Write a protein that holds these residues in place. Structure first.
Motif, PDB file in Angstrom:
ATOM      1  N   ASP A   1     -20.340 -15.205  59.304  1.00 30.48           N
ATOM      2  CA  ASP A   1     -21.373 -14.840  58.839  1.00 30.48           C
ATOM      3  C   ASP A   1     -22.016 -15.849  57.736  1.00 30.48           C
TER       4      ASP A   1
ATOM      5  N   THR B   1     -23.606 -13.550  52.862  1.00 29.33           N
ATOM      6  CA  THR B   1     -22.777 -12.162  53.251  1.00 29.33           C
ATOM      7  C   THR B   1     -20.799 -12.666  53.159  1.00 29.33           C
TER       8      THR B   1
ATOM      9  N   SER C   1     -30.477  -4.051  57.510  1.00 34.53           N
ATOM     10  CA  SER C   1     -29.102  -4.245  56.235  1.00 34.53           C
ATOM     11  C   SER C   1     -28.721  -3.665  55.579  1.00 34.53           C
TER      12      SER C   1
ATOM     13  N   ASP D   1     -27.175  -3.890  52.867  1.00 38.84           N
ATOM     14  CA  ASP D   1     -26.322  -5.087  52.058  1.00 38.84           C
ATOM     15  C   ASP D   1     -25.853  -4.672  50.540  1.00 38.84           C
TER      16      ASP D   1
ATOM     17  N   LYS E   1     -27.330  -1.035  59.686  1.00 40.15           N
ATOM     18  CA  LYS E   1     -26.551  -1.940  60.029  1.00 40.15           C
ATOM     19  C   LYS E   1     -26.012  -2.771  59.232  1.00 40.15           C
TER      20      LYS E   1
ATOM     21  N   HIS F   1     -21.699  -3.691  56.824  1.00 38.01           N
ATOM     22  CA  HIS F   1     -20.476  -4.790  56.629  1.00 38.01           C
ATOM     23  C   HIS F   1     -19.855  -3.941  55.711  1.00 38.01           C
TER      24      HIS F   1
ATOM     25  N   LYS G   1     -18.933  -9.584  63.491  1.00 40.42           N
ATOM     26  CA  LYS G   1     -18.879 -10.622  64.073  1.00 40.42           C
ATOM     27  C   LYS G   1     -17.220 -10.729  63.972  1.00 40.42           C
TER      28      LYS G   1
ATOM     29  N   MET H   1     -28.219 -17.921  66.300  1.00 33.95           N
ATOM     30  CA  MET H   1     -27.892 -17.447  64.264  1.00 33.95           C
ATOM     31  C   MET H   1     -29.111 -17.737  63.555  1.00 33.95           C
ATOM     32  N   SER H   2     -28.951 -16.943  62.449  1.00 37.88           N
ATOM     33  CA  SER H   2     -30.735 -17.750  61.549  1.00 37.88           C
ATOM     34  C   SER H   2     -29.982 -18.631  60.222  1.00 37.88           C
TER      35      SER H   2
ATOM     36  N   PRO I   1     -31.941 -10.718  63.089  1.00 33.74           N
ATOM     37  CA  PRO I   1     -31.875 -11.367  61.648  1.00 33.74           C
ATOM     38  C   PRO I   1     -32.254 -12.149  61.126  1.00 33.74           C
TER      39      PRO I   1
ATOM     40  N   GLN J   1     -29.625 -19.037  54.728  1.00 37.19           N
ATOM     41  CA  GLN J   1     -30.460 -18.415  55.345  1.00 37.19           C
ATOM     42  C   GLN J   1     -31.796 -18.861  55.219  1.00 37.19           C
TER      43      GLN J   1
ATOM     44  N   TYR K   1     -35.771 -16.408  57.146  1.00 39.57           N
ATOM     45  CA  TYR K   1     -36.608 -16.108  57.611  1.00 39.57           C
ATOM     46  C   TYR K   1     -37.435 -16.995  57.689  1.00 39.57           C
TER      47      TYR K   1
ATOM     48  N   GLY L   1     -32.627  -6.812  55.190  1.00 37.60           N
ATOM     49  CA  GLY L   1     -31.584  -6.937  54.370  1.00 37.60           C
ATOM     50  C   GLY L   1     -32.222  -6.626  53.429  1.00 37.60           C
ATOM     51  N   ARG L   2     -32.890  -8.042  52.215  1.00 41.05           N
ATOM     52  CA  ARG L   2     -33.019  -8.024  50.719  1.00 41.05           C
ATOM     53  C   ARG L   2     -34.461  -8.020  50.861  1.00 41.05           C
TER      54      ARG L   2
HETATM   55  O1    U Z   1     -27.299 -14.648  61.931  1.00 47.47           O
HETATM   56  C1    U Z   1     -27.345 -13.662  62.101  1.00 47.47           C
HETATM   57  C2    U Z   1     -26.644 -12.575  62.253  1.00 47.47           C
HETATM   58  C3    U Z   1     -26.410 -11.646  60.846  1.00 47.47           C
HETATM   59  N1    U Z   1     -27.138 -12.200  60.011  1.00 47.47           N
HETATM   60  C4    U Z   1     -27.242 -10.701  58.937  1.00 47.47           C
HETATM   61  O2    U Z   1     -27.907  -9.864  58.715  1.00 47.47           O
HETATM   62  C5    U Z   1     -28.091 -10.008  57.681  1.00 47.47           C
HETATM   63  C6    U Z   1     -29.294 -10.652  57.400  1.00 47.47           C
HETATM   64  O3    U Z   1     -29.545  -9.792  55.502  1.00 47.47           O
HETATM   65  P1    U Z   1     -30.765 -10.686  54.369  1.00 47.47           P
HETATM   66  O4    U Z   1     -32.196  -9.404  55.348  1.00 47.47           O
HETATM   67  O5    U Z   1     -30.419  -9.854  53.439  1.00 47.47           O
HETATM   68  O6    U Z   1     -31.217 -11.924  55.126  1.00 47.47           O
HETATM   69  C7    U Z   1     -27.254 -10.388  56.524  1.00 47.47           C
HETATM   70  O7    U Z   1     -26.026  -8.807  56.810  1.00 47.47           O
HETATM   71  C8    U Z   1     -26.179 -11.003  57.511  1.00 47.47           C
HETATM   72  O8    U Z   1     -24.994 -10.903  57.701  1.00 47.47           O
HETATM   73  C9    U Z   1     -28.212 -13.423  59.019  1.00 47.47           C
HETATM   74  O9    U Z   1     -28.407 -12.989  57.931  1.00 47.47           O
HETATM   75  N2    U Z   1     -27.770 -14.085  60.587  1.00 47.47           N
END
Ligand code: U
Ligand code: U
Lengths: 256, 256
Positions: A94, A98, B34, B36, B58, B60, B91, B148-149, B194, B207, B209, B227-228
């Motif tokens: 991930d 995370t 998300s 989290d 979603k 975890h 995942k 993936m982001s 995401p 990460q 955005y 999420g955040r």
């Molecule tokens: O490509 C991916 C797949 C999952 N994720 C999940 O999505 C969430 C992103 O959260 P965020 O908006 O707080 O950055 C977080 O739980 C990651 O584990 C990604 O950020 N990117």
């Protein structure tokens, strides 16, 4: 080519790799038991009986029906007694933010008891950076998944090269690889190879097997990871000894 | 291009995708929260307050400090009340034989409460085959991680094409993708994205955005995962409404 005992002293060796290489040499074992069981009592009875035969016990904590942190405490007692490392095969995969939480927290608290964990490299190096923030202060190590044993694996060519680069750029925390072969020319890195049985074959869900002689001797890996080849046998101690002797002699014959 | 409500009726639609697309249309939301958080009480308070604003929550589960199956029963009550799917972002990324156990068993019993899970495609199609042997009988769906982001993601080019092929060949169980964009031309498949915030930026662990308008409107995805951008805001309900309205209008403007 250096012995495990000499590799344990290399200038750039990670302390977790050094500890492992020293007990491999002392005990003449390069066998990692894949303890793929659902019962804590069976996990602990295997750890106790096979402890002398193994350098490492690999867990999937998330398939243990009766997981508690106390079970992990008892496993550590056995790891210290018999001298083996604990490797949680969690395959973190991930984003960095995370995986740091998945490694330290939740009900498993993996970082509190696992000497080693592993990660997929597909998310990019943030997966390692997130883990290392928890793992470095807790004196832990990480393996990167450079190659996979399963049919249709996409961990080939440039992907494998990217895993090696990511490892060699995070050597404060990354101590080696899950791979089918030697993938790094740097002797500080450990190669651990799953998909191992004495007999040819596979399973019905894409697992493929190669022998200890093939993966240690011909492919140049360090450690065999063996689950069902031991766990499904009637006498798991004798099976562990067969796998240990196979992997150890393949290692010796590559040394000359 | 079809509305979510029309896509819910496509001949080859999976029942889980159909249920999701119908409630997206009914509630005018293509937002996935998300969630989290580490406290069950915060998870459930967010699910209750934001339930009307979201198509999906979603999880975890492995970062919850106080996970129990009774927490997941309470989450299901809220999912039924407010009409949203539960997606565990686990995942899965191991051999088929292992992921089947990680999905059905252990402490989490993910398949018992998760409408959706996801998997990496890097191990090959055995990962899907293993999951589907638990998920098909339990009428569940799966998303494949095609893109993936995170910075340095290796889920590009041929890797993304392999994820799309694997999905389109396992359509009895695979209902769509984690992706940054539309990757399948088949409207039966869901695209969930995401790495979404209203403002430009990232985090300190890779990460990246993009905005709802970019990912839904320009890149053609279906659902934003946030999420955040919500969780760290003071008023998480108003934040959820801002993300919902952004994603919904971007969807409408692509329809014409
Ligand atoms: O490509 C991916 C797949 C999952 N994720 C999940 O999505 C969430 C992103 O959260 P965020 O908006 O707080 O950055 C977080 O739980 C990651 O584990 C990604 O950020 N990117
Ligand atoms: O490439 C890989 C990585 C991990 N593993 C794991 O190693 C173990 C193999 O077990 P087996 O010997 O029973 O096939 C099992 O726990 C898998 O999850 C692989 O089999 N292949």
């Amino acid at each position: 080519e250096l012995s495990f005992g000499a590799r344990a002293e290399l200038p750039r060796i990670h302390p977790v790799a050094s500890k492992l290489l020293r007990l491999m040499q002392k005990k003449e074992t390069n066998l990692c038991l894949s303890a793929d069981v659902s019962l804590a009592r069976e996990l602990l009875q295997l750890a106790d009986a096979l402890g002398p035969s193994i350098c490492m016990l690999k867990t999937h904590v998330d398939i243990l029906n009766d997981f508690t942190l106390d079970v992990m405490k008892e496993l550590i007692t056995l790891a210290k007694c018999h001298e083996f490392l604990i490797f949680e095969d969690r395959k973190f995969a991930d984003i960095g933010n995370t995986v740091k939480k998945q490694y330290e927290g939740g009900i498993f608290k993996i970082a509190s008891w696992a000497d080693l964990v592993n990660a997929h490299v597909v998310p990019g190096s943030g997966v390692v950076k997130g883990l290392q923030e928890v793992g470095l202060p807790l004196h832990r190590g990480c393996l990167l998944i450079a190659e996979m044993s399963s049919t249709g694996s996409l961990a080939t060519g440039d992907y494998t090269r990217a895993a090696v680069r990511m490892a060699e750029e995070h050597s404060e925390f990354v101590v080696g690889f899950i791979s089918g072969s030697r993938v790094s020319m740097k002797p500080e890195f450990l190669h651990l190879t799953p998909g191992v049985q004495l007999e040819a074959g596979g399973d019905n869900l894409g697992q493929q097997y190669n022998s200890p002689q093939e993966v240690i001797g011909k492919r140049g890996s360090d450690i065999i990871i063996v689950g069902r080849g031991i766990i499904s046998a009637a006498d798991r101690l004798e099976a562990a000894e067969m796998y240990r002797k196979a992997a150890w002699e393949a290692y010796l014959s590559r040394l000359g």
